[PDB]
Amino acid sequence: MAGHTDNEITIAAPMELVWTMTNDIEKWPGLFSEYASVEVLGRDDDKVTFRLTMHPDADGKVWSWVSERVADPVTRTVRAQRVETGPFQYMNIVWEYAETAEGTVMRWTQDFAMKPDAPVDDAWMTDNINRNSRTQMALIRDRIEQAAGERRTASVLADLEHHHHHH
Numbered sequence: 001m002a003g004h005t006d007n008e009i010t011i012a013a014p015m016e017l018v019w020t021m022t023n024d025i026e027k028w029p030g031l032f033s034e035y036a037s038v039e040v041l042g043r044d045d046d047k048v049t050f051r052l053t054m055h056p057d058a059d060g061k062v063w064s065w066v067s068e069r070v071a072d073p074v075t076r077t078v079r080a081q082r083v084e085t086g087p088f089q090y091m092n093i094v095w096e097y098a099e100t101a102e103g104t105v106m107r108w109t110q111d112f113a114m115k116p117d118a119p120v121d122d123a124w125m126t127d128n129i130n131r132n133s134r135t136q137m138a139l140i141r142d143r144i145e146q147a148a149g150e151r152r153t154a155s156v157l158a159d160l161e162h163h164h165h166h167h
Contacts, residue, residue: 002090002113003122007133011141012103013148015076021144022078022095023071025050031143032136037064046071089113106141108133 011018021027025048028038037053048071053064065084072079078095085091090113098105110129114122 001115001118001122002111003126005110005112005126005129005133006107007110007130007137008098008105008107009133009137009141010100010102010105011145013145014153015097015099015104017148017151017153018097018104018106018144019071019073019076021147023048025069031140034136041066087114087116087118089115106137108137 025038025040029035034054035052036055037051039051039053041049041051043049048069049066050069051064051066053062056062065082067080067082067084070079070081076097076099078097080093080095082088082091082093090111092111094107094109094111096107096109098107112122112125114120114125
């Protein structure tokens with residue numbers, strides 16, 4: 001009735017592009033095939049509140065839910081909590097970015113608690129999540145890494161000479 005799934009994956013993309021790309025929810029449909037539209041309801045500075053709209057079901061009914069994605073710059077943490085949720089009694093998706101020697105390690109800490117009409121013991125979800133995470137996170141991993149390879153971002157050359165100014 002509560003599963004802590006912590007799927008971490010290493011990316012060779014600079015923090016800047018990692019942060020800005022994941023904050024740009026409007027380009028999510030270009031990385032995530034799971035959704036159809038990402039609508040920005042409002043941006044409360046740190047809180048980017050969006051509506052995740054999917055493709056219609058077998059009856060032609062479109063599915064969508066509101067979720068709050070909080071950008072916590074201090075700990076390099078993103079907190080995406082779902083406002084609307086059914087089978088998942090609790091769900092807070094914490095994306096922590098860990099600046100490591102290999103690159104930016106992206107940690108998907110999914111704190112979810114299933115119980116309301118949950119046919120799974122949470123562990124069932126975690127197992128599938130671990131597997132699918134490798135699929136989706138690697139997809140995004142290369143996707144954004146290719147973007148960081150396409151656009152050089154900031155390298156050790158822009159500040160090759162420091163400004164010699166403490167003011």
